[PDB]
Amino acid sequence: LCYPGSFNDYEELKHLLSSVKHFEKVKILPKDRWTQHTTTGGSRACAVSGN
Amino acid sequence: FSNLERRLENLNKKMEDGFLDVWTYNAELLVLMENERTLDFHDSNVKNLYD
Fold first, then answer.
1. What's the rounded Cα separation, in Å, for the pair A40 and A43?
2. Whole-angstrom Cα distance, residue B6 to residue A9?
3. Mind telling me how many Å the CA of B14 is from chain A's nearest CA?
4. What positions belong to coiled-coil segments (chain B) (predicted)?
5. Please, what sign has the CA dihedral across residues A23, B10, B20, B26?
């Protein structure tokens, strides 16, 4: 976690991922649906090439 | 167990499967080892009458 924090039920997730093998990443809530909001935030903690 | 206790359910399952393999293995070898000896016992006893 490049942005400091915690992950709840992390050990249970790692256990869940044992009996998984492949999974497909599916877009559920496309970033551009969030009109009337700013979707471009970020932090120097997770910076890429300075930015 | 609840759906957030998968590692505990798995711990329980493993403990039970572990004891089952131990008791099954012991039952199988105790029977085979005892049968080897029963038959040798009987052969010994008839030879003992002979002598």
1. 10
2. 11
3. 14
4. 1-21
5. positive
